[PDB]
Amino acid sequence: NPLFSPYKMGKFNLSHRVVLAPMTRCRALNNIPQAALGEYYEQRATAGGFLITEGTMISPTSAGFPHVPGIFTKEQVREWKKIVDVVHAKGAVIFCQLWHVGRASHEVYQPAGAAPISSTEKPISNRWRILMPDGTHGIYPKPRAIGTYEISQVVEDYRRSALNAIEAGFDGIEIHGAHGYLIDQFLKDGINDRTDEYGGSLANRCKFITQVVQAVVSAIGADRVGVRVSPAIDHLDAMDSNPLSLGLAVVERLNKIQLHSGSKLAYLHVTQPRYVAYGQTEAGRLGSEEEEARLMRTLRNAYQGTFICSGGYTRELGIEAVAQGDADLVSYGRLFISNPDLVMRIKLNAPLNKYNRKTFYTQDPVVGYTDYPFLQ
Amino acid sequence: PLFSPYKMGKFNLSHRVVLAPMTRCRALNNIPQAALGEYYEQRATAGGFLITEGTMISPTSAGFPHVPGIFTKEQVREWKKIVDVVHAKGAVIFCQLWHVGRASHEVYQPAGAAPISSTEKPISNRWRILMPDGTHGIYPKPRAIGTYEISQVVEDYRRSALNAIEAGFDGIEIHGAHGYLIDQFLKDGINDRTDEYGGSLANRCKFITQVVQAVVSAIGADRVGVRVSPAIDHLDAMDSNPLSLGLAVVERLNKIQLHSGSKLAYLHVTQPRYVAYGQTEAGRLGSEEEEARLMRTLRNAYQGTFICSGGYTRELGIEAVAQGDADLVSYGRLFISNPDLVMRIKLNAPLNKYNRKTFYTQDPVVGYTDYPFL
C-alpha cells in the first residue's frame, strides 16, 4: 500500500501519507481553542502522521464562521500550546492553517458590525449562504475594497500569526489561499475587478498571495510554510476564466519565492473539484474524472516540491494518486471527521464510519466531534 | 399512504408505487424484444402504473445502444405484444418518447450527421456516452438546429405518439428532462440561441410547449404525461433560476390544459438530490432547503397529478405521499432488482440489491429478468 510508504517532507520523516485536511468545526468557543480540540486532534494523531488544523483567525476581521479559533492573541497561543503538546506526544507533525475569509463574512462576525474586507466591493451572490451564530443561514453582504496600505496591514497580520503559531509549538503554518476566501478574492478574475497593481494581469492578481507567502517565509522560514490553493474550485463565486493558467501562474510565483529564499516551502496543497456521480440519472455513472486529473497533474509537475492533493479522495483514489506519482501526500476531510482512526482503517482496509453533516459546525464539545467510534 | 388508492384521470390506481422509465438496452437493433415483455410483466401489478424505458421517435434520436423505437410499424407491432402482457395483469402503461439531442454519437447517427440541439456547444469532457461494445465514448459537437427544423422534430413526437396509441399504450410520457433534447432548449446554461427559441424564459419554453401541444392535439391531453427536471446535474444541464424555469413550464402546461379543456395525465419531476461542493466549507449550506422549496413550489403550482422521482426509498416515498408533496412516487433502481417491489414495499420486506454492472448489458435474462421474487 503506497499510502504507507514513508515520505520525507523537508526535515519531517512521515511514516505514511494520509493527512488530516484542515476543517472548520466551530468548537473553539468565542475564538478560543478549547480542551475539546485537544481531544479531537489527539484522537486523529498518529506516529509519523501529518495533521493540519482547522482554519484559524489571523485578526479580528478574519472570521466568517462562529467559534473558529484565532491565533492572533497570546491567550489563544496559550490554549493552542496544550493541543500542540498532546499531538506531539503521539508523534505527529501539525501545522496551523491561517485563514482570512475576506468578503465571506457578515456584520455579526465583524468588530463594531463593520463591513467585511476584500479585493472588491462585489458581494458573494445569493447562490451561497453563510452560517449564522444561531444556526440559520444568512446572506453575504457587500464588502469594502481595501487599499495598498491596508493590504500591507493584512500581510502583517499573517506574519504576526505565523510567529504566534511557532510560539505555540506548531511545526509550521498553512496559508489558506483557496475556496473563494480573501487570497482567492485577489487571485480569481471572476472576483478581482481592481484597476490598480493588485488587479488585471496574472502577475497583478498573484501579487497578494506572493506578498503573504513572502512575509511568512521571511518570518519563520520557508520550510515551515505550506500553501493551499484551489484554482479550479468556484466555491463562493470564485471562478477564473482560465483555471489552469491561473494555477500555473501561482505555482511559478511559489517556485520563484523558493529560488530567491534558497529554500523550499513545506508543500503546495491543492483542492480539486470532485463531481459526485449520481446513480439516479441515465449517464451519471458513465462520467470521466480525466480532465480534472490532468489539471492536478500539471500543477504538481510544475511545482518544485511536495504536493498534497485533496478533494473527495477515498482509500482507492489515494492509493492511485501516490502510486501514479500524482501526489506525495493525500489529505482527507469528511472521512477523517467520522473516523478518528482513519489511518488505521485505511491501512487495514476496514469499513469506514459514515459522517453526519448536521454536526459538522455545531458547538458541542463531544456530540459529532469526539464521539465517532474507533475500530473495535 | 403508498397503498391509498389514487385516481389519475380515468385510471383508478390501487397504489402509489410507479415504475420509473428506465433505459435497459435489451431492445436489440432498436426493436422491442420478448424479453421486455417478461421484464415489464414481472413488475406489473393490478392497478399499478408503469412507464417504459425512453423510446426513439426518429432514426437519429438515440444515444444508447439497443434502445427501442416506436417510429416504424414493425416496432409498433412488437410493442403491442408487450403492452398486452402488461394489461393482462391489470396494469396501466405509458410509453416514454425520447430524443437525446446533443447526447448522441456518430455510431448512433445513421447519416453520420452531427447530433441536433439548441446549441453548437458540446457536452463537456466529464461526461461520456455508452458505446455498442460497452466502452465509453466522447460526445461530439452538436448542430444548433435552425428555426425551421424545430417543427419537423415536433412532428416526430406527434407521429410517435400516434404510433404508441396504435400500439395500445394507455398514453405516452414526454421525456423533457435530464439534459436531453427538450431540456437543451429549456436550460439557459445550454440554450444560447438568439432567435425565437432562445433568450427569455418564454422563448426557452417554446419547444416543450410545442411538443406537448402537438401530442395533446394528436391523442388527447388525458393520454399525455410530461417529465421535467428544473434542477439536475446531468450532461451539463444547468439554469440560472431553476424555480423560475420550472414555474414557467408549469404555467404553460396549466394553460394547455385550460385551452384543451382536459388535464394532462400528470407532471413527472426529478428530485434534484443536489450534493455539489460537499468538500467545501460552505457549499452545502442551504442546498437541501432550496430543492425542497423548489419541488413544493412546483407541486403547488401544477394543476394536476404530480409524480416525484429520484432517490426515493420506502420511507421517503411514504413521507412524500403523507405530506402532500406528491401523488405518485416512481422508483428506478430498486425496481430493477426487485420485480415485486410493490409487494415488498407493502410488506416492508427485504429488498434485493441491484447490480449496476448489468444495467445496460444486452442479456435478455442476466441482470434483467433473473432478479428473485420474495
Ligand SMILES: Cc1cc2nc3c(=O)[nH]c(=O)nc-3n(C[C@H](O)[C@H](O)[C@H](O)COP(=O)(O)O)c2cc1C
Ligand atoms: C466541515 C468542513 C470544514 C472545512 N474547513 C476547511 C478549512 O477550515 N480550511 C480549508 O482549507 N478547507 C476546509 N475544508 C475543505 C477540506 O480541507 C478538504 O479539502 C475536503 O474536506 C476534502 O474532501 P473530502 O472531504 O472528500 O476528503 C472543509 C471541509 C469540510 C467538509
Ligand SMILES: Cc1cc2nc3c(=O)[nH]c(=O)nc-3n(C[C@H](O)[C@H](O)[C@H](O)COP(=O)(O)O)c2cc1C
Ligand atoms: C439504469 C437507469 C436508466 C434510466 N433510464 C431513464 C430513461 O430512459 N428515461 C428517464 O426519463 N429516466 C431514466 N432514468 C431515471 C429514472 O427514471 C428515475 O428517475 C430514477 O431511477 C429514480 O431514482 P431511483 O433509482 O433512486 O429510484 C434511469 C435511471 C437508471 C438508474
Ligand SMILES: [Cl-]
Ligand atoms: Cl521544518
